[PDB]
Amino acid sequence: KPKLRFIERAPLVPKVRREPKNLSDIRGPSTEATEFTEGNFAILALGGGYLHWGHFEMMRLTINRSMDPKNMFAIWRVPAPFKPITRKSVGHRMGGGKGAIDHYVTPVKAGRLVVEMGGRCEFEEVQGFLDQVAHKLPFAAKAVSRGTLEKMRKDQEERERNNQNPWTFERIATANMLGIRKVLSPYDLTHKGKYWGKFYMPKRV
Amino acid sequence: SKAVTRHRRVMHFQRQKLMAVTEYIPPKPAIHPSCLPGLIRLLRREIAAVFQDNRMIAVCQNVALSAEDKLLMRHQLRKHKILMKVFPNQVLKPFLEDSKYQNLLPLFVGHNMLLVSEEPKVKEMVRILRTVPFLPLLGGCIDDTILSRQGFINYSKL
Amino acid sequence: KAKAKGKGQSQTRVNINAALVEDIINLEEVNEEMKSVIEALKDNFNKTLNIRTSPGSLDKIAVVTADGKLALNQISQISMKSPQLILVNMASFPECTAAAIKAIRESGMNLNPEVEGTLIRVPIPQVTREHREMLVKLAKQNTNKAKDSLRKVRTNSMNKLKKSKDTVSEDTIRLIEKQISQMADDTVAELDRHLAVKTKELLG
RNA sequence: AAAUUUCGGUUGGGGCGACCUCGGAGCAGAACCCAACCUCCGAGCAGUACAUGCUAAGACUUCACCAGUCAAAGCGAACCUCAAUUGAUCCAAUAACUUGACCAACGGAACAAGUUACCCUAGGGAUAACAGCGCAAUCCUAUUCUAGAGUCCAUAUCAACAAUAGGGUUUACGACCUCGAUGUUGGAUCAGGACAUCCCGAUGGUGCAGCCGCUAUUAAAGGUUCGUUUGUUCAACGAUUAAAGUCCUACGUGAUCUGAGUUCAGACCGGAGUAAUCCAGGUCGGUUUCUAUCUACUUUAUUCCUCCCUGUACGAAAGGACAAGAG
RNA sequence: GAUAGCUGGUUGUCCAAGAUAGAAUCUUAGUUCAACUUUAAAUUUGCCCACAGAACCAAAUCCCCUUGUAAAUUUAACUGUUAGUCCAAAGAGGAACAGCUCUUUGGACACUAGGAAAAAACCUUGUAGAGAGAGUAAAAAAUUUAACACCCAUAGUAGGCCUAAAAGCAGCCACCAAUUAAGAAAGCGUUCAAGCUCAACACCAAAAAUCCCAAACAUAUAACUGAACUCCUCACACCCAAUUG
Ligand SMILES: [Mg+2]
Ligand SMILES: [Mg+2]
Ligand SMILES: [Mg+2]
Ligand SMILES: [Mg+2]
Ligand SMILES: [Mg+2]
Ligand SMILES: [Mg+2]
Ligand SMILES: [Mg+2]
Ligand SMILES: [Mg+2]
Ligand SMILES: [Mg+2]
Ligand SMILES: [Mg+2]
Ligand SMILES: [Mg+2]
Ligand SMILES: [Mg+2]
Ligand SMILES: [Mg+2]
Ligand SMILES: [Mg+2]
Ligand SMILES: [Mg+2]
Ligand SMILES: [Mg+2]
Ligand SMILES: [Mg+2]
Ligand SMILES: [Mg+2]
Ligand SMILES: [Mg+2]
Ligand SMILES: [Mg+2]
Ligand SMILES: [Mg+2]
Ligand SMILES: [Mg+2]
Ligand SMILES: [Mg+2]
Ligand SMILES: [Mg+2]
Ligand SMILES: [Mg+2]
Ligand SMILES: [Mg+2]
Ligand SMILES: [Mg+2]
Ligand SMILES: [Mg+2]
Ligand SMILES: [Mg+2]
Ligand SMILES: [Mg+2]
């Protein structure tokens, strides 16, 4: 079955407890599966965000449209919708309890994979719909593969190790040079100076 | 405003100053290196074999002939005992200069269909070349000896 | 020239609130009644009388023959001969031909088919503006009847809302009333669109 | 029928809906700590003795107080479990231990209702209806990969699922100065500005044989009708010209005007209400001030119709033009 | 001379200290306690403190000797504060919007000084006067992505299944191999074949309504200018709302 299985919202067990919208699930690197698995290409998420059922449907349609059913195969790398997003009625005073359930969504972090690819095909044969879906996503995406992933990682490592700038970001954050921690965040010390809410700074060290 | 936002939140003054001061500074090459300093073996073997078996090889400039014209030429060359050859020039120039054939060096250039042979073909070839409205025979090569079309037709008369 | 007030707000209020829809009162029932009225009006329009061209249009109902239903465009290769004459080529079924003739004779088009075993001829000389105006007036009367039915439905809904008004927030009552009014306006707009389409089909 | 009184509090303005005491889970993640019109689970108790007896060093203590919690021992017999699980003063019964609350408006007046558009007064934009202001949930405009139509033909044209940029013109959303006053819509004279341009000027394509058409760019120097109704811009219709365009101007302009009604006192119609009064229900009519102080101001080419072009180019026929001059 | 949680005001000079966790209240426009602050006095430990100590279902926090210091407890008084706003992070509801409503840690504003244009909340900086003195903290935005290596075509043939038909692209199979040296065909166009290319060989981002808004220069040597911050001659009690001494 070299095709993306059908995705549907509202799981078989809709949680009734209205959980609070937490932003920590978007901040930070992709703690979940980051490397490839039983494949060769993937869609590296260069920025946090969200994914709705329509997004998954459009991605599945675009993949099934241009894809060889006897030379490639893709596997889902994101679970089904679950995060309850309670949206109040457009036109009411602030207050009066919490809104009811509206739609589910699967959060995503930076450096997370969405859909994978396999088979004895080159990266150029995928590049098309790869970059297409990447531009469709609601966050900064880009076509990435094993070789290209390793290449960009080595390039980032070389840039970090050869940075002529005697002063870096972590060296100033952890050590607290000029007491700038008052503006910085507690998570910045754990991570690097490349994150900011959800975006990603691949050019910055 | 909340921590995470759909748009790019404006960073603090000190935050922006730190981000700008902690920018990446690549190296500065003082000189930059930009301003600093298989099948070919089979081709060579075939060219050497041809040179060793070129008792009466000819050279032309067959290019204006269509596919059907080339087929008709091959049929004519099969009628009277004689074969045709088509090899590159990049791999033939080194062997040309190495075989002491200096007169043939400036000849081979661009397009040229060689016609190797062994048996006498002085009249049939002349007729096959006259049947068309072209005379690309830019001096053949018999027993490794320089000779123009005049000498060729003279030997043919004999 | 905007006249575009809040409607998506009411739609979202109706979609989100589930307990209210389950208690006050039955949005599903209201929508079902509205759709049933719309379908009844559409049937009254496309089933009373109209110069419906193309044999595929007349292909509707016919008495069961030999324990098997049948229609026009099903087994016969019909071919429009002229606007004043239609051809028929049954599949060797005199009983089905007689059944179709009987079903067509009971129509309101005032036809006089000339059957000849398997061939049928249903000519139509021409139609003047009198029949068109009569059909337009009948469609207007049917639209008025549908409007009266929607009025009765909305009156029942308002009576229910009033019965359930004491121990209920007056704001929610007013919002439900506005939603019902918007639904009635949308239904009236759909009915007017259907009437205009029917008038265009009749005259055009 | 007379005599006194009241009509408790929260509500992202007030009523309505719901709540008014206490315990636990996340917010509050590792001494304590903190918010509920943020999402939940429970209780005004439940089962055996009656040493659940009399005394008393030291402590915790719901962020105060009142109220609550643990306890070496001393005398007397031995050879309680649970998490909220509740009730202060006065007063009453009681020879006297002891007891008395859905005071739940639960730190608790001994018992008190509905309306005021007939209202008065002290104040509040701490707190509303029109604005201004900020957002852009809703809409419009442009672009990005083509999904799908368009007879072959995604990109003449329409255009789903999404993202990227501009809007505060509609509905709200927040109440930030303006309730010791910003006079509320249309309709009259006057119009200033912006083009997401209806038309007069110029181009590219076209499902351009021509007009009639469609699309994209520039051009705002100008024009943008006459009337029948409902108070309502909006809302239907008759005839015009090439067109009867959108938006901001404190829903442009009431110290220029208007009262049709929108905020008032009376009445009527149906309803709510035992009654007074009310439907944000419908109409009968409802005093519109200003004597100018200041700032500022107060005199410079557009279109349509007609004539040679006429039935021309264009076809298969119908049909039917370009420019220029003149009235 | 009523009362009134309510509007208004509450008279000369100068010095000093001087911003609050919360609870109850027929209550959140008002009152009390607590907490902050002021005066006179008796006592000794007040803060960062170092090994360690402090739970099964990340920044952190408590005690903490030497060590910097001179601050802290109590007694007796009594007025004043007990509606806050913004910024960085954890957040909570809202639309992962609002100069949107509420907490936790720090700063600022209610208190002057030098700047970011006119700014409360942003950066730097506080003990108060003179001099026609000197040295410094914060302090001036940068930047223009799109061509392209454009030479050149025999055939076992229309391979087989269905397709009256797709033979090379309605659908499936293997995809050989002769041209001297390369597709049972990667696009375009055909009902269908016809025609045109290619793979390869031979040099090869912008738009809203009064009118756009600081003049302005790429080419004389990195250092200057820039406070009430520090220093220089003198003497110093002489820059906080309410309240207090
Ligand atoms: Mg209240
Ligand atoms: Mg205590
Ligand atoms: Mg004991
Ligand atoms: Mg209590
Ligand atoms: Mg009580
Ligand atoms: Mg009372
Ligand atoms: Mg009255
Ligand atoms: Mg307003
Ligand atoms: Mg199509
Ligand atoms: Mg306000
Ligand atoms: Mg006011
Ligand atoms: Mg007032
Ligand atoms: Mg005033
Ligand atoms: Mg324009
Ligand atoms: Mg106005
Ligand atoms: Mg005026
Ligand atoms: Mg009366
Ligand atoms: Mg009567
Ligand atoms: Mg007047
Ligand atoms: Mg004057
Ligand atoms: Mg004057
Ligand atoms: Mg008094
Ligand atoms: Mg009071
Ligand atoms: Mg006052
Ligand atoms: Mg006085
Ligand atoms: Mg002081
Ligand atoms: Mg009470
Ligand atoms: Mg507020
Ligand atoms: Mg201040
Ligand atoms: Mg000083």
Short mmCIF file of N, CA and C (backbone and C1' of nucleotides) in Angstrom, two decimals, chain C residues 1-6 8-9 162 165-171 174, chain D residues 14-18 137 170-172 234-236 245-247 272 280:
data_model
loop_
_atom_site.label_atom_id
_atom_site.label_comp_id
_atom_site.label_asym_id
_atom_site.label_seq_id
_atom_site.Cartn_x
_atom_site.Cartn_y
_atom_site.Cartn_z
N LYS C 1 -24.14 50.73 -0.66
CA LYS C 1 -24.89 49.58 -1.15
C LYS C 1 -24.28 48.28 -0.64
N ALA C 2 -24.18 48.15 0.68
CA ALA C 2 -23.61 46.96 1.31
C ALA C 2 -24.69 45.99 1.78
N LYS C 3 -25.57 46.44 2.68
CA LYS C 3 -26.64 45.62 3.23
C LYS C 3 -26.17 44.20 3.54
N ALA C 4 -24.98 44.08 4.13
CA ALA C 4 -24.40 42.79 4.50
C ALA C 4 -24.15 42.81 6.00
N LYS C 5 -25.18 42.46 6.77
CA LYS C 5 -25.10 42.47 8.22
C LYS C 5 -24.49 41.16 8.71
N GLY C 6 -24.53 40.93 10.02
CA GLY C 6 -23.90 39.76 10.59
C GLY C 6 -24.70 38.50 10.32
N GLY C 8 -22.48 35.21 9.39
CA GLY C 8 -21.52 34.23 9.83
C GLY C 8 -21.42 34.14 11.34
N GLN C 9 -21.65 35.27 12.03
CA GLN C 9 -21.68 35.25 13.49
C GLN C 9 -22.79 34.34 14.00
N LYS C 162 -40.86 31.16 23.29
CA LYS C 162 -41.52 31.92 24.34
C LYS C 162 -41.88 31.03 25.52
N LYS C 165 -38.69 30.67 27.89
CA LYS C 165 -38.11 32.01 27.96
C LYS C 165 -37.89 32.45 29.40
N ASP C 166 -38.73 31.96 30.32
CA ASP C 166 -38.66 32.37 31.71
C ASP C 166 -37.27 32.10 32.29
N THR C 167 -36.91 30.83 32.44
CA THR C 167 -35.62 30.44 33.00
C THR C 167 -34.54 30.34 31.92
N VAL C 168 -34.48 31.35 31.05
CA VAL C 168 -33.50 31.40 29.97
C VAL C 168 -33.04 32.84 29.81
N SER C 169 -31.77 33.02 29.47
CA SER C 169 -31.23 34.35 29.27
C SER C 169 -31.90 35.03 28.08
N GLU C 170 -32.41 36.24 28.31
CA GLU C 170 -33.08 36.97 27.23
C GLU C 170 -32.14 37.21 26.05
N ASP C 171 -30.84 37.33 26.31
CA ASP C 171 -29.89 37.50 25.22
C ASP C 171 -29.89 36.28 24.30
N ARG C 174 -33.06 36.34 22.20
CA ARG C 174 -32.97 37.27 21.08
C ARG C 174 -32.05 36.72 20.00
P G D 14 -21.95 45.59 34.62
"O5'" G D 14 -23.50 45.99 34.70
"C5'" G D 14 -23.95 46.96 35.63
"C4'" G D 14 -25.44 47.19 35.50
"C3'" G D 14 -26.31 45.94 35.63
"O3'" G D 14 -26.57 45.60 36.97
"C1'" G D 14 -26.98 47.20 33.73
P G D 15 -27.22 44.17 37.34
"O5'" G D 15 -28.72 44.28 36.84
"C5'" G D 15 -29.61 43.18 36.96
"C4'" G D 15 -30.74 43.26 35.96
"C3'" G D 15 -31.24 41.92 35.44
"O3'" G D 15 -32.16 41.30 36.31
"C1'" G D 15 -30.90 43.42 33.63
P C D 16 -31.88 39.82 36.87
"O5'" C D 16 -32.08 38.88 35.60
"C5'" C D 16 -33.31 38.89 34.88
"C4'" C D 16 -33.16 38.23 33.53
"C3'" C D 16 -32.53 36.84 33.54
"O3'" C D 16 -33.46 35.82 33.86
"C1'" C D 16 -31.49 38.16 31.89
P G D 17 -33.13 34.79 35.05
"O5'" G D 17 -31.98 33.86 34.46
"C5'" G D 17 -32.22 33.03 33.34
"C4'" G D 17 -30.95 32.39 32.83
"C3'" G D 17 -30.09 31.70 33.88
"O3'" G D 17 -30.55 30.40 34.22
"C1'" G D 17 -28.73 33.06 32.52
P A D 18 -30.82 30.03 35.76
"O5'" A D 18 -29.36 29.90 36.39
"C5'" A D 18 -28.48 28.87 35.99
"C4'" A D 18 -27.05 29.18 36.34
"C3'" A D 18 -26.74 29.34 37.82
"O3'" A D 18 -26.59 28.10 38.50
"C1'" A D 18 -25.75 31.11 36.63
P A D 137 -8.13 37.71 11.45
"O5'" A D 137 -9.37 37.26 12.33
"C5'" A D 137 -9.52 35.91 12.75
"C4'" A D 137 -10.93 35.63 13.19
"C3'" A D 137 -12.00 35.80 12.12
"O3'" A D 137 -12.15 34.66 11.29
"C1'" A D 137 -12.65 37.00 14.04
P U D 170 -17.99 50.86 8.68
"O5'" U D 170 -18.74 49.57 8.13
"C5'" U D 170 -20.03 49.67 7.54
"C4'" U D 170 -20.76 48.35 7.58
"C3'" U D 170 -20.76 47.64 8.92
"O3'" U D 170 -21.69 48.18 9.86
"C1'" U D 170 -20.14 46.11 7.24
P U D 171 -23.25 47.79 9.83
"O5'" U D 171 -23.31 46.35 10.51
"C5'" U D 171 -22.87 46.17 11.85
"C4'" U D 171 -22.69 44.70 12.18
"C3'" U D 171 -22.11 44.40 13.55
"O3'" U D 171 -23.07 44.44 14.58
"C1'" U D 171 -20.97 43.13 11.91
P A D 172 -23.25 45.75 15.49
"O5'" A D 172 -22.84 45.26 16.95
"C5'" A D 172 -21.49 45.29 17.39
"C4'" A D 172 -20.86 43.92 17.32
"C3'" A D 172 -19.83 43.61 18.40
"O3'" A D 172 -20.42 43.20 19.63
"C1'" A D 172 -18.94 43.02 16.30
P C D 234 -30.54 54.59 -1.39
"O5'" C D 234 -30.34 53.11 -0.84
"C5'" C D 234 -29.07 52.48 -0.87
"C4'" C D 234 -29.04 51.23 -0.02
"C3'" C D 234 -30.02 50.13 -0.42
"O3'" C D 234 -29.55 49.34 -1.49
"C1'" C D 234 -30.15 50.49 1.91
P A D 235 -30.52 48.99 -2.72
"O5'" A D 235 -31.89 48.58 -2.03
"C5'" A D 235 -32.06 47.30 -1.42
"C4'" A D 235 -33.50 47.03 -1.09
"C3'" A D 235 -34.50 47.33 -2.20
"O3'" A D 235 -34.60 46.27 -3.14
"C1'" A D 235 -35.27 48.29 -0.19
P A D 236 -34.15 46.48 -4.67
"O5'" A D 236 -35.53 46.49 -5.48
"C5'" A D 236 -36.35 45.33 -5.54
"C4'" A D 236 -37.73 45.66 -6.04
"C3'" A D 236 -37.80 46.37 -7.38
"O3'" A D 236 -37.69 45.48 -8.48
"C1'" A D 236 -39.18 47.49 -5.83
P G D 245 -24.86 55.78 -9.59
"O5'" G D 245 -23.80 54.59 -9.75
"C5'" G D 245 -22.52 54.81 -10.32
"C4'" G D 245 -21.48 53.90 -9.72
"C3'" G D 245 -21.03 54.23 -8.31
"O3'" G D 245 -21.93 53.77 -7.32
"C1'" G D 245 -19.14 53.79 -9.66
P U D 246 -21.90 54.40 -5.84
"O5'" U D 246 -20.60 53.77 -5.17
"C5'" U D 246 -20.51 52.38 -4.91
"C4'" U D 246 -19.19 52.02 -4.29
"C3'" U D 246 -18.81 52.80 -3.04
"O3'" U D 246 -19.43 52.32 -1.87
"C1'" U D 246 -16.97 52.73 -4.52
P C D 247 -19.82 53.34 -0.68
"O5'" C D 247 -18.42 53.74 -0.05
"C5'" C D 247 -17.55 52.75 0.48
"C4'" C D 247 -16.18 53.31 0.78
"C3'" C D 247 -16.14 54.53 1.69
"O3'" C D 247 -16.28 54.21 3.06
"C1'" C D 247 -14.74 54.89 -0.17
P A D 272 -51.45 37.18 28.28
"O5'" A D 272 -50.12 37.79 28.90
"C5'" A D 272 -48.87 37.13 28.74
"C4'" A D 272 -47.79 37.78 29.57
"C3'" A D 272 -48.15 38.08 31.02
"O3'" A D 272 -48.06 36.94 31.86
"C1'" A D 272 -47.14 39.98 30.06
P A D 280 -39.64 42.72 23.97
"O5'" A D 280 -39.07 43.71 22.86
"C5'" A D 280 -37.71 44.10 22.85
"C4'" A D 280 -37.54 45.55 23.21
"C3'" A D 280 -38.07 46.56 22.20
"O3'" A D 280 -39.48 46.75 22.29
"C1'" A D 280 -35.91 47.20 22.89
#
